[PDB]
Amino acid sequence: LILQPNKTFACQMYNLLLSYDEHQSLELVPNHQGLTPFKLAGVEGNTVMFQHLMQKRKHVQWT
Amino acid sequence: WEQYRDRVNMLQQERIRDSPLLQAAKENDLRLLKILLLNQSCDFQQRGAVGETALHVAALYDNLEAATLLMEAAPELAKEPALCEPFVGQTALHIAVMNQNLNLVRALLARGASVSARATGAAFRRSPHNLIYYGEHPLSFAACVGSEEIVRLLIEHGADIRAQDSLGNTVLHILILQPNKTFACQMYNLLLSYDEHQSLELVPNHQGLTPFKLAGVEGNTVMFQHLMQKRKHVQWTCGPLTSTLYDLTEIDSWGEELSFLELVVSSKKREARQILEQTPVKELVSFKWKKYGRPYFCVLASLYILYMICFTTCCIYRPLKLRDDNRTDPRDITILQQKLLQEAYVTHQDNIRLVGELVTVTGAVIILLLEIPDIFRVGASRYFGQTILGGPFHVIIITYASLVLLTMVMRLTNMNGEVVPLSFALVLGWCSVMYFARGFQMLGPFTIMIQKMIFGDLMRFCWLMAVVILGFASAFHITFQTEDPNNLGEFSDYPTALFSTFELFLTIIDGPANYSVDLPFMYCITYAAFAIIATLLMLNLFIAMMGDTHWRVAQERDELWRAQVVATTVMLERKMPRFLWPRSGICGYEYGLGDRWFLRVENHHD
Amino acid sequence: WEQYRDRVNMLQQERIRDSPLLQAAKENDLRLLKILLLNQSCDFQQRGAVGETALHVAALYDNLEAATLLMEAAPELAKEPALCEPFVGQTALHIAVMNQNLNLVRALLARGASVSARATGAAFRRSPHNLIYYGEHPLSFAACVGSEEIVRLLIEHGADIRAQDSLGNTVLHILILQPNKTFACQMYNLLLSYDEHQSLELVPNHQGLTPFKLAGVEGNTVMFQHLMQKRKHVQWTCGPLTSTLYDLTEIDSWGEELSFLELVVSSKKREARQILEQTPVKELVSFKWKKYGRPYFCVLASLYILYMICFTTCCIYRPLKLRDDNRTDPRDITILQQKLLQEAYVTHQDNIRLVGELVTVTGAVIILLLEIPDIFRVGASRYFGQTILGGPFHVIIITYASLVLLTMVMRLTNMNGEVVPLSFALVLGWCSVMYFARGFQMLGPFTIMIQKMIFGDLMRFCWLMAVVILGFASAFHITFQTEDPNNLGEFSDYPTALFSTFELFLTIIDGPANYSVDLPFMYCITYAAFAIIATLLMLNLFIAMMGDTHWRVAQERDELWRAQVVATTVMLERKMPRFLWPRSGICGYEYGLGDRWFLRVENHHD
Numbered sequence A: 001l002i003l004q005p006n007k008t009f010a011c012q013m014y015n016l017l018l019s020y021d022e023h024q025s026l027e028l029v030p031n032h033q034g035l036t037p038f039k040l041a042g043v044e045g046n047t048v049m050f051q052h053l054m055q056k057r058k059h060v061q062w063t
Numbered sequence B, C: 001w002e003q004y005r006d007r008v009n010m011l012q013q014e015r016i017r018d019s020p021l022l023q024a025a026k027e028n029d030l031r032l033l034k035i036l037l038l039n040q041s042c043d044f045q046q047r048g049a050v051g052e053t054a055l056h057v058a059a060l061y062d063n064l065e066a067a068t069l070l071m072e073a074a075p076e077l078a079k080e081p082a083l084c085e086p087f088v089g090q091t092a093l094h095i096a097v098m099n100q101n102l103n104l105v106r107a108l109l110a111r112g113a114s115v116s117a118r119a120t121g122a123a124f125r126r127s128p129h130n131l132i133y134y135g136e137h138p139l140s141f142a143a144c145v146g147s148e149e150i151v152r153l154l155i156e157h158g159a160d161i162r163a164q165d166s167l168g169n170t171v172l173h174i175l176i177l178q179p180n181k182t183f184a185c186q187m188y189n190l191l192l193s194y195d196e197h198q199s200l201e202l203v204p205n206h207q208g209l210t211p212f213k214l215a216g217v218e219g220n221t222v223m224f225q226h227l228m229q230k231r232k233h234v235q236w237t238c239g240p241l242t243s244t245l246y247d248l249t250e251i252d253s254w255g256e257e258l259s260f261l262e263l264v265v266s267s268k269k270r271e272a273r274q275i276l277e278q279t280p281v282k283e284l285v286s287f288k289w290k291k292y293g294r295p296y297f298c299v300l301a302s303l304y305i306l307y308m309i310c311f312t313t314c315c316i317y318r319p320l321k322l323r324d325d326n327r328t329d330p331r332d333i334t335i336l337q338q339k340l341l342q343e344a345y346v347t348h349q350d351n352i353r354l355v356g357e358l359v360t361v362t363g364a365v366i367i368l369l370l371e372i373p374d375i376f377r378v379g380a381s382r383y384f385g386q387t388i389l390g391g392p393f394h395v396i397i398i399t400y401a402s403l404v405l406l407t408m409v410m411r412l413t414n415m416n417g418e419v420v421p422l423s424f425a426l427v428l429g430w431c432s433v434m435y436f437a438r439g440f441q442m443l444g445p446f447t448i449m450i451q452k453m454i455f456g457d458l459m460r461f462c463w464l465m466a467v468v469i470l471g472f473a474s475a476f477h478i479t480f481q482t483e484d485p486n487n488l489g490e491f492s493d494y495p496t497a498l499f500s501t502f503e504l505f506l507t508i509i510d511g512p513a514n515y516s517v518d519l520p521f522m523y524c525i526t527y528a529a530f531a532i533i534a535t536l537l538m539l540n541l542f543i544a545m546m547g548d549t550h551w552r553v554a555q556e557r558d559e560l561w562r563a564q565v566v567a568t569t570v571m572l573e574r575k576m577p578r579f580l581w582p583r584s585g586i587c588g589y590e591y592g593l594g595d596r597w598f599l600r601v602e603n604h605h606d
């Protein structure tokens, strides 16, 4: 789903996969190359997918 | 260093997370917070990492209900500020004003929290590290973020209007220091609706700047126009055209030494040159330049051109005499040497040269008497580094005067080697005539983009160029260290091997080619590669870089030419006789309107 | 000088402010103004600083009620105008018309104020100082500001339509002189609604221009299109395509000497070349150029090329003979000298040269017979300074004819030094063939951008060249006054030190480098700096500057090529036989439509 040509809407459908990922996790399993999906989004230049991945890791501590 | 602020912020999160009361104030949950209000075993006056109370946290996270809960549980807790290094005086009322919480600010002023509290910490003072400069006062914060009801509630609850911080800026200065937000102009009107009895408009900071002068130096054009909606008034109109008079009392600033236009044109900020095109500023300096600035600048330009003519015809005819010891040396050129001073002035032509020598020495004296107080009055880094005020030319003219005075030192000591100060003075001084080329509208910004190329392109490209001519010069030297220096002596020793490779980089000197001898076979290989990488590739790339910076200047030619003529107009406003430079504008004391000088311009709109 | 007008304007404000009546008329307050009407001690005919009455003030500040109250106080006060220098004849009816007050203008014409009053002040005459040129008449002001009901009210209240000012312009001329406003075009129809019995369209000014010719010379393209809606009519249409005939009676202007197109192409205003692309002008001069202009211009271009070939093969074979005395001089070149006229024509080849000499002399005669009446008929600054009409080439051809006539003068006096005027004539005349290069569509505007760069770029860059080659030439000279002029004599004396530094600036002559002798150590330092600042920096900045100027021309290539072919088409329209240049357009006298010549064009629209 990362390897698409920068389509926005499957971004939300990425959430659907992470809506149903349960018990490692699907986010940490590598391929035969040995790449995390975060690393695949990094190497393929999917910036929208990268920003959507960094919505979950970050949190605001104060404003 | 900014990692300390990250450590303080996550240590604040540590002290919030450890304490159950501060965690309950952050999370906005009232359930355990009721028991925290009820029991007397817990301490409500506990400190954070800095000094933030739980009411500080509840003001920080827009938690007004928990703040009011411990504020009934502790009414005296609101007045204590933070007490560590980044927040040495931050109250929660500053945070509640900054977050625009109307009910929390109304409750905080209803319970008598301090309104004149100064938050003089390092985070609130201006810096490149802090992203905002909202000030140190609650009235400052309320006007500066742009909330009307909060600042009017602060006026009705105390908060005297004059509030100078550690930098000395009042409210109007740091309303002007915003990044060009329009609506704060209307907020400025609110402050000028509530300014009464000097006035707030005239009080300076620790730098000694009016808010008008701070608007001029910071480039805030919208505030500058908004300030001159109050100063101007139309005196008559007919048809499409109105005639209006502008007050130049704080523009020309006749009483004050350090003038307003000197603060505009010598500003380090880039955006302070778009404020120099405004509707009474362009006309005032255009009247100064056309009526006075161009004729006195042109006669000074002709006088300096004649001074350099009288200097170059003085030094072309300099004393040299035939040497007594014969040459007797191969690879040498010498006919004649320098002349001693006892026979340097013996004929009438020597006296005609000598009066020119005294002209040049007194020219050096009147140059250094017009630069040393001028470099002392504004500082070294302010005046030499500013490209608008002719600083690169003003170090060159100073270097000329020091070099010809060093010539005057050397000649009376009768020692040789005087070709070098005449050569440096004669190359630097005729390039300083470009300093007088800023006046003409035809040939003005050419001399600013020449110095722009010198300090932008050929500061970066010379380090990329001195790693090619060094390596290729060393490569050419080794291929001709084995050979002779007679048949092909362009790389005989290493200084001329550097200089010939430099000249071959510039394609001035022809390629080293002697077809009557067998050249080394490595030389053709390492010179063909030189002709690829250096004459073809790096030279014309740097020509294209000159074309790009020439385009970059040529889109904005008039914006720098007007700044150049403002700089030289306010330079000839100073250092010149007062009877020859009368006050620009018309007087108006005989017109009964006061002892203020004005400028009438007329426009043409629909 | 414009400061006098500022002094007059605030002196007007002084005379308003001192008088209570004028202040009451300015402020629009009736309370003390009623007492000012009642008492007879005050004088209602008091003057301003110029002559502005209270009615003038109340008309100037849009105060109709106080104006009408003082007209009931004084009905005779309206007819008196101002009487000082900037407002020589300004009435307040001009001001009320200009401010578009319908009720005030109706009251002023109801009380019998003058409608034919000429406002002959310096503020109303056209100048760069005055921002508007609205005219001198009330009908002029009403038709010029853009009001319909006011101008029709002025038609019904007198105001004869023909109204020539001190410049002699009528209403239509100074309705054309607006900055291209569309709606006034329709109000031109309003003037053409009330023009009756010559007509108003044909009356000239003091310059001698028809209003159609004024629209031609001022570049008012929208008014030109509106004027040629009236002249043209469609004769048939089918499908998408219409055929319409345009009247060229005032385009060609066969009766008048100074033609319409001569006023268009020799206009000082830049915007008068976009009117030259219009639908009845472009087809007419394209028919003139294709049918007649290009063949006669090409045969004149071939005749001038053959004349210069017959001149250069005449002056290459010039009389030259071996000198009688021997040289006996080092640093000298001379083999042969000039030849005396008694032996300059002795052989048949000398006669073949001699008939070419008479060809060149009669060519100079027929050149100066085609330029001296032509420079007398339009003036010196009109014709030499205009770049469209080949003025830079027409000073060059005149310089050719004067130089070869001076060569013929010098040859018959048998004195030497004829190499110099022959050399200037021979170099200037082959550059004048670019004058014949304006005709071809391929290589046309290259010759206009070459002269554009000569007069634009290299008049500003020559002064920035002469502060570098002078300083560096003088710096190179001092390093080689000490040394010998044999091993490195490129800076021996100061004229060749200027010329060699100029050539080293231009990168033509190779760098002065003699590796078989020890050069001065300052020379390499001050020449490395020269190769940086001049060959690398200063030159290619000017090369990219020429590239930007070439881009500026090349965005507008066809707009200048069409102007060039219009200029040479109307220049070959004059100075040429009438039987060889028949009248363009078709006659229409045999078609019974009148003695007016027309041009039929067909178009293709949806």
Ligand SMILES: CCCCCCCC(=O)OC[C@H](COP(=O)(O)O[C@@H]1[C@H](O)[C@H](O)[C@@H](OP(=O)(O)O)[C@H](OP(=O)(O)O)[C@H]1O)OC(=O)CCCCCCC
Binding pocket: B270, B384, B385, B386, B387, B391, B392, B393, B395, B396, B452, B455, B456, B457, B459
């Ligand atoms: C003539 C002798 C030297 C005069 C000393 C005074 C020299 C002098 O007046 O300029 C100082 C200059 C920095 O330039 P400076 O502080 O005035 O600021 C720059 C200047 O405004 C340039 O015009 C800008 O364009 P560019 O990007 O550059 O094209 C540049 O970027 P930007 O505004 O467009 O964003 C601005 O940052 O520093 C040196 O390189 C000198 C190195 C040599 C030091 C030699 C010390 C002798």
Ligand SMILES: CCCCCCCC(=O)OC[C@H](COP(=O)(O)O[C@@H]1[C@H](O)[C@H](O)[C@@H](OP(=O)(O)O)[C@H](OP(=O)(O)O)[C@H]1O)OC(=O)CCCCCCC
Binding pocket: C270, C384, C385, C386, C387, C391, C392, C393, C395, C396, C452, C453, C455, C456, C457, C459
């Ligand atoms: C060939 C001998 C000289 C011929 C004399 C006649 C020379 C001649 O015909 O032009 C006159 C010229 C002024 O040019 P001129 O009045 O025609 O008007 C300029 C002309 O239209 C240019 O093409 C325009 O572009 P640029 O900006 O220039 O690129 C320029 O600006 P703009 O329209 O774009 O806004 C216009 O202002 O004045 C000199 O420099 C001559 C100095 C040398 C005088 C030497 C006297 C011998």
